[PDB]
Fold tRNA (guanine(37)-N1)-methyltransferase Trm5a.
Amino acid sequence: HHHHHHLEVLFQGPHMSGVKVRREDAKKVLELLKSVGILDGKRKAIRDEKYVIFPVTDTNIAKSLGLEVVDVELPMRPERQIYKNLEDLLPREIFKKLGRLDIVGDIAIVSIPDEILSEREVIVSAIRKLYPKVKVIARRGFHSGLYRIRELEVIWGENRLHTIHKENGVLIKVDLSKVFFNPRMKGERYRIAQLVNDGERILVPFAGVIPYPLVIARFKNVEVYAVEINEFAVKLAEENLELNRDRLKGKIKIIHGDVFEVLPNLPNFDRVVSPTPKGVDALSLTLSKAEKFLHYYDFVHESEIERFRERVLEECRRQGKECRVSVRKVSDYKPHVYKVCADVEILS
C-alpha cells in the first residue's frame, strides 16, 4: 500500500469550494490565500453587496486559516481574451477616473489620481492584459521645467523610461525621464508630411527628439531645420537621425539652441511647423520665419477659438502678410480645452 501523503494528490476532479469573506477583508484575504498557496487560479472570484468568494484548492488549510468554507459553482477563468478596451477590464468607477493611457514603445503611461491609487494592482493588471507586450507601466504626473519633462513613476515592470517607438515608418528613440514626447501627434505628423512638397525648406522649432522632421523627411525630399534647447533631446535626436538615415528621403539639420535666440539668425523658410510647448507664445517669431505656410500649434479654451483665429490674423497683418488662416481642433486636451493648429497660408 501507498503512503497517504502520496495518495492525497491523486484526485482528478475540479475544486468545488471557496472562502466567503467580507469585502473589507477581501484584499487582505486574497494576499493570505496567495501566500499560503491555496488560491485556485482556475476559477473566478465573485462578489455581492457584502461578500467576496475566493476559489481555494484546499478547504482544510482554509479552515486552519479561520476562513468560512462554502460550496459554490464559480466561473471558470477565461481561456480566450476578447477585451479590446481598458473599460472592458475595469469597474467603471475606476476606469472613469483614469487619465488617458498612452503607449510609447514598450512603455505604458497612465494617469492615476490619488483617490484610486488604492486600486493600483487591478489597474496594472488590466493594462498588462490589454497590452501583453509592454514591459513598463508608469504613472503620469505633470510637466516640469524648461524642457517640459513629464513627472513619471514606474509602477510596474523594468525600471527604465527609455525605449524605441515606431511611427509612420520611422524609429524614435525616447527617454521619457529626460525629454518630452507625445505619440498622439502621429496623425498630425503624417498629415503635414503629406502636405509638404519636394524641394521645400522647412523649419521645426521645439523639435524635441525630432519626430516631426523625421516623419516629414521620411515621406518627402526636403531640407528640415530642427531647433531644440534640451541637450538630452538633441542627443537623442542625433541618434534618431543616425538610426533612420537609410530610410529618409529628405535631409535634417539639428540645431541645439534657444528657439527665441536661434530663429532671428536663420534665413526664412517655405514652411514652418511649430509644435509649441503648452503656454508658450511663439506665434510672431515662427510666422516671421515662414514664407508660404505656418503650422502653429496651441492650446485654447473652446470659448476662445475665434479670438485665437483673430489674433493669428492680427499678427499676420502686423507683419504685413496677406494670409488665409484656418484653425483645426487637433485633439481634446481637457474638458472645454482643445489642442489646436493654426494653418496659415501666406498669399503672394
